[PDB]
Amino acid sequence: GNTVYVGNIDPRITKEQLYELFIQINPVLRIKYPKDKVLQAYQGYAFIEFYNQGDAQYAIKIMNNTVRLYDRLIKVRQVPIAKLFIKNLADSIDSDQLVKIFNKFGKLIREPEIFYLSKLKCAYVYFEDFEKADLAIKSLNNQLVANNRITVDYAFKNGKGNAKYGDDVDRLLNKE
Amino acid sequence: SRPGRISQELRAIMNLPEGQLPPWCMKMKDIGLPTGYPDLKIAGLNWDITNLKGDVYGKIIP
């Protein structure tokens, strides 16, 4: 009730700095900021405990998608994904066929989202793992599916696939 | 460390150039001041903009 989940923290961010940031928003009781013991790095997320439910709720309203630390937008919720842009789908290509085409390369976190630019049928596909996302790019970029030639690369957030997605590795290791 | 002060190191990490209010102050106009700091003054909201100097953008003044 009084604790909030903070996500998408660049691993160079120290705990002193998390305290310095969140005391601007309300007084802070404690911070749990987990360290991966093997790598001796932080894991991308923290838990910030305020003094009561009200201050926490305030913090979530104010802080959520307001602050960029090392250019990355911080998330704050109560209680790190491989996203690909696919261009030039055939009319035939269901949401289901996308699932079947990308399944074979690795696990998908959610179902695809289809949208249209300009006539130009596109989709977002969401992979659990950047390692698996890479295979799908290599195998399907500039290839023929249902007689249409598609392109496959990482979506814009400026792009997914940056180095600081060792956050992907930490979350896979620690099981989301 | 205090509410209303932000170190140069954190400012650099935030990409916040000097003479600018931190990005969360805009939302405070809509939603209101911090529930845990009833007496917080922020320069350009409820404190004269002349006080926005250096690391300081606000201060708890009753």
Residue numbers in the entry:
A (entry chain A): 8 to 86, 106 to 144, 147 to 185, 187 to 205
B (entry chain B): 289 to 350
Copied sentences from the primary study:
Spliceosomal proteins Hsh49p and Cus1p are components of SF3b, which together with SF3a, Msl1p/Lea1p, Sm proteins, and U2 snRNA, form U2 snRNP, which plays a crucial role in pre-mRNA splicing. The structures show that the Cus1 fragment binds to the α-helical surface of Hsh49p RRM1, opposite the four-stranded β-sheet, leaving the canonical RNA-binding surface available to bind RNA. Hsh49p binds the 5′ end region of U2 snRNA via RRM1.
The Hsh49p–Cus1(290–368)p construct yielded small needle-like trigonal crystals, which diffracted to a maximum resolution of 2.7 Å, but at this point we were unable to solve the structure by molecular replacement or isomorphous replacement, partly due to twinning. Restrained twin refinement led to a final model with R/Rfree of 18.4/23.3. All three molecules in the asymmetric unit are very similar, with average overall RMSDs for the main chain of 0.45 Å for Hsh49p and 0.23 Å for Cus1(290–368)p. The refined model contains residues 8–86 of RRM1, 106–185 of RRM2, and residues 187–205 of a C-terminal extension of RRM2. No density was observed for the first seven residues of RRM1, the linker connecting RRM1 and RRM2 and the last eight C-terminal residues of Hsh49p. In RRM2, the β2/β3 loop is disordered and density for one residue is missing from the linker between β4 and the C-terminal extension. This C-terminal extension of RRM2 (186–205) forms an α-helix, which folds back and wedges between RRM1 and RRM2, interacting with RRM1 via the β1/α1 and α2/β4 loops and more extensively with the longer β2/β3 loop. In addition, there is an interaction between the β-sheet face of RRM1 and a symmetry related Cus1(290–368)p in the Hsh49p–Cus1(290–368)p crystals. The buried surface area of this interface is about 505 Å2, but a complex formation significance of zero implies it is likely a result of crystal packing. The flexible linker between RRM1 and RRM2 is about 20 amino acids long and should allow independent movement of the two RRMs, indicating that the relative orientation of both RRMs held together by the C-terminal helix in the crystal structure was indeed most likely due to crystal packing interactions.
